[PDB]
Ligand binder design. Structure first.
Ligand SMILES: Nc1c2c(nc3ncnn13)CCC2
Length: 167
């Protein structure tokens, strides 16, 4: 049994809800919240920017030190950093950004990072300002992630379309 509430059921392991991931993280304090990161861990806009704002920029400070030591992530890669006031840990995952011309086949590699964690609160990778089709992102999620994932979808209209169209 876990703390996640109101999540709609998709498969054995994937659950979905219309929610603000910041507000959901603040309520649940999950072991892992996933950030929709870029390779530079520059959290200016999108989920990364909303999560970072909710940490009062502490996520960005920690991320800048990580990059100064380790260099950029790979597209499709991830790192585990603090969850600050939102979660125990934040898994920063880099999905391909279609608005930068990145290979969408890297989306499966991105979701494979989730399998290293038994339970996660996450957004749909490569959706929103990353430019991918969220229906496609949900399909790759369900077909890739084997661990228990609780997906938060910010837009109510999109949530309803994702549920209604789910095979
Ligand atoms: N959960 C959010 C928030 C914001 N912008 C977003 N863009 C995608 N998701 N997302 C600002 C308020 C919270």
């Amino acid at each position: 049994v876990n703390s996640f509430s109101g999540y709609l059921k998709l498969t054995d392991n994937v659950y979905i809800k219309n929610a603000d991931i910041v507000e959901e993280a603040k309520k649940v304090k999950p072991t892992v919240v996933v950030n929709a990161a870029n390779v530079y861990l520059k959290h200016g806009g999108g989920v990364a920017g909303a999560l970072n704002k909710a940490t009062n920029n502490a996520m960005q400070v920690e991320s800048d030190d990580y990059i100064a030591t380790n260099g950029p992530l790979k597209v499709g890669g991830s790192c585990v950093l603090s969850g600050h006031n939102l979660a125990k840990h934040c898994l920063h995952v880099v999905g391909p950004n279609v608005n930068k011309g990145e290979d969408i086949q890297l989306l499966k590699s991105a979701y494979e990072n989730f399998n290293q964690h038994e339970v996660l609160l996450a957004p749909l990778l490569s959706a929103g300002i990353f430019g991918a089709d969220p229906i496609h992102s949900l399909r790759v999620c369900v077909d890739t992630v084997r661990t228990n994932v609780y997906l938060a979808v910010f837009d109510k209209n999109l949530y309803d379309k994702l549920v209604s169209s789910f095979l």
